Amino acid sequence: SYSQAAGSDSAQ
Amino acid sequence: SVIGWPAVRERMRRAEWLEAQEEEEVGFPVTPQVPLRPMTYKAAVDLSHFLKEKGGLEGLIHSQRRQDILDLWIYHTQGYFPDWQNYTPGPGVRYPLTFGWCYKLVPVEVLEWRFDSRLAFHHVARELHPEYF
Amino acid sequence: SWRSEGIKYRKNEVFLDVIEAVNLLVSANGNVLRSEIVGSIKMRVFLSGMPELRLGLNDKVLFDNTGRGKSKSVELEDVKFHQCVRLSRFENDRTISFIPPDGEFELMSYRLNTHVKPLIWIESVIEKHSHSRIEYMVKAKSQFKRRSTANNVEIHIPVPNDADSPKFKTTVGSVKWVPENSEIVWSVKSFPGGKEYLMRAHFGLKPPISVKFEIPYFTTSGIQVRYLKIIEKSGYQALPWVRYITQNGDYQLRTQ
């Protein structure tokens, strides 16, 4: 079971 | 978040022979489906304003400890990797690397947190250090 | 599959699997002779068209170079990339940039020569049970976080080539004898962290003990995929998914 990941470096 | 802050605000105010060698239960568990992500512009902006509104951070003297308290709080309560609250190296004013984060650190180097809305629009740190981006 | 144009999916998604193998060599005395993580990222890419991907990790060198050194990162070694990755970008500013193949493949591989405690620790004590009957008392302990669980752990214990008539008793799991390999194998379908389990074996009348295991939802190195960026020209809805699996690789405890 997978966790959804972010689509960009919102933080930089 | 909201009930969360006052608690952690005080924690922050509070902050400020041998190292007790620390022991491990090895490894880094990942809670199966809970998503983790870098801080977003909007979230950074919202939070900046929330803290501004509620007070507590403005003019607080900065230390890594105090910052850490903050970052971890956001990490647990919101799932934001605590790699977002870095600031440009000094000396001088230290500008946040995360566009949207409307605080900065101003010498009073003994620095303090200072709100500055311009930062939601002018990504200064990127001007100063494009390589970081 | 090398992505030709106009690959199409109902649903645009990526799955990443961060797998870490743990190599471990302990001495009879319990001295960790060597200890190493060998990791890799497997991707299963279900993406329409011709997208451009950028992988964000808590890479130490990257953090150090992007003003984020104060933050917790992971120091990757002997990094190797699938051919789609643009080495120059990685070389220049540590960017991981690539147009992916369709389907399944290994994006990258890496090492860490870090020396944390063995996840799973085996003590095996040999006593005289009766006559020329010999007894093995063995303890196994999980030294990883209580909230985590190893699965299908197998503890291979060598026994002498001429032993016979094994008898076994264990608190947990199950044991069998494998004369061909001249060893006994203690299997534990599911082994929570912070546990100690005991097995006893005796026989009528060397190689090291080795162990196999897998821990899902878990890394040793503390590597994290921060983000995966997907830029396609349509400007579509794509989703990345991630999971982290630790497992053994080459995990040996010397008996003496």
TrEMBL record, chain B:
Positions of the record's site feature: Cleavage: W17, L18
Q: Where is this region: SH3-binding?
A: 29-38
Q: Where is this region: Acidic?
A: 22-25
- Supply the InterPro entries for this chain: HIV-1_Nef_anchor_sf (IPR027480), HIV-1_Nef_core_sf (IPR027481), HIV_Nef (IPR001558)
Q: What is the lineage of its organism?
A: Viruses, Riboviria, Pararnavirae, Artverviricota, Revtraviricetes
Residues that span the membrane, as ranges: none
From which domain of life does this come?
Viruses
Write out the residue ranges of the motif PxxP. 32-35
Q: Which Pfam families match?
A: F-protein
- What is the protein name for this chain? C-terminal core protein
- The protein's site described by Might play a role in AP-1 recruitment to the Nef-MHC-I complex is found at M12
Q: Where is this region: Mediates dimerization, Nef-PTE1 interaction?
A: 68-84
